[PDB]
């Protein structure tokens with residue numbers, strides 16, 4: 009915590025928040041459930057108002073049940089029912105309908121109960137929160153969230169990697185001490201190579217999605233020479249490095265490790281697909297490891313957000329060897345292209361080569377296309393029966409026959425025998441211990457450089473729009489995680 | 502703390518306080534200095550805003566100096582100067598003018614400094630408080646202050662005394678447990694004896710004055726049969742009882758005890774006279790002792806509040822033997838009549854009889870008048886030289902020659918040799934140990950009864966106006982003293 013910048017984190021007088029009161033989305037789900045500081049303040053409100061004690065405690069107890077160890081869940085289920093649902097219980101929740109109480113006592117246990125609790129809280133209690141000091145305090149935090157926090161607030165201290173338009177640095181937010189990755193995009197190069205649209209798509213997607221399986225955007229700003237995206241630091245290298253460059257004589261992963269990453273990637277794909285986004289660039293090098301060994305998908309510049317009521321799109325984009333037949337054939341396509349790419353990615357994790365080309369085999373584009381469109385993939389012994397079936401189901405040429413996103417989720421896919429030893433609740437909650445933990449002393453990265461133009465208003469306005477500033481949810485997470493929320497939200501110190 | 506009533510003490514939603522925001526006096530002195538909860542919230546505001554730390558701490562340190570023991574004041578004076586006034590002091594108070602800093606370092610030390618600190622705080626910092634959550638919290642407390650807290654909130658448990666229109670009871674405020682005296686005025690009797698004007702004057706004065714030397718009014722309400730004034734409980738009896746009825750064979754007080762009460766009564770008189778009120782009924786029976794042995798003046802039904810720009814009044818009122826010559830002569834008079842009554846009161850405390858009549862001597866009104874107007878008071882040996890001079894100065898027939906209120910205070914009077922061993926700072930602050938402490942087991946009171954009419958709108962409207970409800974300053978003191986303020990002013994429990 010550099011004190012100069014820490015000192016600029018101060019809550020404003022209430023008059024300064026009046027514009028925000030009119031401009032913000034202040035809906036229940038968006039404010040009190042999704043935004044961490046909103047949720048904290050709403051729960052503080054409920055905690056100070058006796059009437060709402062039962063409801064608050066039931067809510068917390070369901071959320072605790074949902075992330076409990078399997079060994080303790082039967083206990084927690086019995087304690088919850090005894091506390092809130094049995095006839096004369098001391099915290100009996102009078103607001104619940106009889107069906108919901110009945111459903112809750114029999115036998116995503118409590119997911120219906122949670123929906124009912126949250127539905128209750130979004131009515132009278134939310135209205136009372138809006139008429140409380142805690143709502144005004146939320147507005148003060150939103151004002152602070154919106155203040156300039158640009159290049160001066162970040163200390164770049166190490167190069168993490170090299171992209172097409174600049175380096176990615178390990179950096180520290182000076183006020184809080186939180187470590188991030190800062191991806192720099194050189195303005196002149198972006199302009200020269202007509203990279204504006206791609207840069208903006210990546211920024212917009214990373215800003216709007218919130219998943220433990222996708223790198224999160226916390227800040228977007230500009231300097232004289234660069235656009236900058238401050239995002240989750242992934243210190244563990246990329247899957248490509250780990251397939252080939254750690255144990256070079258024996259490349260590839262053991263099945264359990266490959267399956268674990270597959271399960272995480274699938275969860276990230278699902279999250280995009282539920283938001284009508286097609287990734288279009290899944291491959292080992294775009295999947296990054298954190299220092300715990302959990303992975304996230306990254307590099308979202310080729311992604312497409314389908315319009316409202318848009319079921320399919322068109323356009324040639326992606327990496328040769330990962331692009332699905334329907335894309336290569338120039339047809340309309342949807343999320344299915346990403347599942348094709350997942351099959352290729354799993355294949356490579358196990359085989360240490362791609363399904364269509366041997367090591368060192370370099371072919372004309374036309375030949376690679378004909379192989380992806382027509383050639384039957386072959387599977388060595390390394391592949392267990394479950395691995396082969398799964399790959400086969402994902403590498404199907406016809407997208408209508410391909411395994412993937414069905415009925416608004418990947419639940420169908422999750423039931424595949426490949427995932428027999430994966431506990432999905434704990435995977436999705438980030439509870440499971442990864443099979444590989446990167447060494448903090450080790451850098452999991454590879455050790456040539458490339459060879460002027462005035463900017464006009466059109467360029468500078470684009471850079472200004474790109475530099476949208478601070479993303480609400482990650483910023484609020486940072487403030488809470490680093491202790492600044494606790495420190496500034498004091499009432500009587 | 503009866504829980505039924507304690508449960509009704511809950512802070513409202515902010516929408517309920519909007520009327521109060523428009524109707525209340527929200528000036529700096531009235532809100533942030535005089536009202537205990539206002540002061541507490543303003544100081545909490547200052548404590549949470551780094552800029553105002555020096556100012557807040559200097560303020561607190563001056564107030565602590567003002568109530569410190571004489572033995573520790575030199576220390577405290579040196580510490581204050583070193584902390585806030587010396588050139589490069591860590592909490593140097595930049596806002597102070599050079600004169601004031603200079604004055605503060607040389608040689609009511611710090612009274613000029615306090616005025617300057619408070620003048621500073623009443624500008625920018627007060628404006629910032631008004632734009633804070635702490636001001637809104639003040640409004641919530643003011644809303645609660647204004648809610649119905651009538652007959653049902655009080656438990657009468659013992660008779661303390663008998664007045665002209667009803668009994669005075671020891672009572673408990675059910676929600677907080679605080680002990681009070683409740684003076685009841687029977688409605689039918691008040692009406693019959695045309696006692697409305699007197700009842701109202703007492704209520705209005707006790708509500709508006711705030712002195713440790715005058716009984717404080719906390720609540721005024723009505724029942725079907727009575728008007729009720731809830732005020733400071735004075736469990737120690739009255740001075741009349743203590744002069745005559747404790748040691749019956751040897752009545753009267755030792756000089757030091759008499760002098761101490763005189764000093765307290767003088768302080769109470771001064772407080773009324775600074776507020777342009779003439780008491781008109783000082784006598785031993787109207788001076789009550791608390792369980793510490795400190796006294797207060799009480800029984801304010803004969804008082805008169807001089808109008809704005811009114812220097813003198815007219816009207817025959819008071820107790821025979823305590824009424825001054827100018828009153829008896831039917832002339833205009835001011836505060837001087839109360840100093841005459843003080844001389845009579847001191848005389849009786851020492852002599853165990855009045856100055857104009859021997860024990861058992863009962864005379865025509867005309868004879869008593871002639872004695873008060875013309876007779877020279879004589880003083881037994883019991884009176885020390887200082888006691889006699891003081892009485893003489895107070896019993897002067899001509900009010901122009903009489904000792905009393907001069908230049909807006911009683912400071913002239915305080916310098917009299919009578920008060921040689923009285924430390925006035927500590928007296929006025931309630932620090933001094935009284936010379937007599939009443940026994941809690943003992944009742945300091947004497948052990949015949951007196952022998953119907955429909956009420957009209959005119960009566961019921963008067964009773965309604967009388968029943969003005971809760972007095973701000975005592976109610977806020979109660980909430981703080983009993984812990985309810987602490988309990989309800991929690992932010993994150």
Ligand SMILES: Nc1ncnc2c1ncn2[C@@H]1O[C@H](COP(=O)(O)OP(=O)(O)O)[C@@H](O)[C@H]1O
Pocket residue numbers: 168169170171172173174175176189191223239240241242243246293296306307308309
């Ligand atoms: N969040 C991150 N944490 C750590 N390293 C990163 C992160 N994002 C990118 N990198 C490193 O920087 C490289 C370039 O980033 P990338 O997003 O792939 O850029 P481009 O869009 O130009 O390909 C990556 O291959 C990786 O080595």
Ligand SMILES: Nc1ncnc2c1ncn2[C@@H]1O[C@H](COP(=O)(O)OP(=O)(O)O)[C@@H](O)[C@H]1O
Pocket residue numbers: 661662663664665666667668669682684716732733734735736739786789799800801802
């Ligand atoms: N605050 C009090 N605490 C304890 N006893 C009180 C208090 N006020 C009055 N009393 C008792 O009740 C008696 C009657 O009250 P008082 O105010 O003198 O009534 P009145 O105006 O009718 O003379 C007093 O003489 C005293 O004994």
Ligand SMILES: [Cl-]
Pocket residue numbers: 139140141142
């Ligand atoms: Cl509130």
Ligand SMILES: [Cl-]
Pocket residue numbers: 329361362363364365
């Ligand atoms: Cl390939």
Ligand SMILES: [Cl-]
Pocket residue numbers: 632633634635
């Ligand atoms: Cl505030």
Ligand SMILES: [Cl-]
Pocket residue numbers: 822854855856857858
């Ligand atoms: Cl007399």
Ligand SMILES: [Mg+2]
Pocket residue numbers: 171307
């Ligand atoms: Mg890349």
Ligand SMILES: [Mg+2]
Pocket residue numbers: 307308309310
């Ligand atoms: Mg890219």
Ligand SMILES: [Mg+2]
Pocket residue numbers: 664800
């Ligand atoms: Mg009386």
Ligand SMILES: [Mg+2]
Pocket residue numbers: 800801802803
């Ligand atoms: Mg009276």
